[PDB]
Design a protein around this ligand. Sequence first.
Ligand SMILES: O=C(O)c1ccnc(C(=O)O)c1
Ligand SMILES: [Mn+2]
Length: 228
Amino acid sequence: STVPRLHRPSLQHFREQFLVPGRPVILKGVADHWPCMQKWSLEYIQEIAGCRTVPVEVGWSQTLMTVNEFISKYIVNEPRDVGYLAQHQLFDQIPELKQDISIPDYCSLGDGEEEEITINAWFGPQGTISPLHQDPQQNFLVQVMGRKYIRLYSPQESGALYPHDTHLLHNTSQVDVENPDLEKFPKFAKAPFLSCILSPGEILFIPVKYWHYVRALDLSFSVSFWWS
Ligand SMILES: O=C(O)c1ccnc(C(=O)O)c1
Ligand SMILES: [Mn+2]
C-alpha cells in the first residue's frame, strides 16, 4: 500500500500514531522551505564542496575523489559506471552546508542527545540502488533534489526477506526487491509492504529497524537524520 502523507503533524500526533507504533509516514510542509531546497544546484555544490574529498561507492568498490571529480565522472559526462556519494557525513566535513538544513523538531521526541544525531548525505545520479536493509535507529530521510522510489517492509516480515547469514550483513536482505528470485526466495512474493515516490521537500520517517530499499529516479540528493 501507500505511505501516508501528513502536513506538519503535531509532535503528539506523530509520537502516538507513528513513532511509538513504528509506522512510516511522509511529513509535508516541514522541510519544504529549508534553504537547501532552493540553493543546492550542481553549481552551488561545486562552489562550496568541489575541492573536498568524498567517499564514493562504485558499482562493488569504495574509492575517494573530490566532489568535482565525482560530478564530472559520475553525474554529467555520460557516466561509464554507477557512482554514489553515499552515507557520508558531509555536513560535519563542510559546516557551511549545515546552514542550509535543520534538525527536525520531531527528533526531540527521542531519548538520545541531539549532538549524537548522525546526518548523512546521499548524492548520486539516476539509478542508484540501495538494497533492502534495516538500520538500528529511527530515521528522517529528507529529499532535496530529484525523486526516489522507496519500498518498506516491517520488521515483522524479516522471515520473508532472507537476511544474509553473516553478522556483518545480517541487516541486509539477500533478495533483489525489484527482480526477486522466487525460486530461491519464495516467501518474498507474499510479504506485504508500503512504497512511495519521495519528492523534493518531503521527509520520509523510517521507523527503527524498518526494512527499506531505495532507487533514485533522477539526479538525486537526500539528507538522512539517524536519531534515537
Ligand atoms: O537514499 C539512499 O540511497 C539510502 C540508502 C540506505 N539508507 C538510507 C538511509 O537514510 O538510511 C538511504
Ligand atoms: Mn538505511
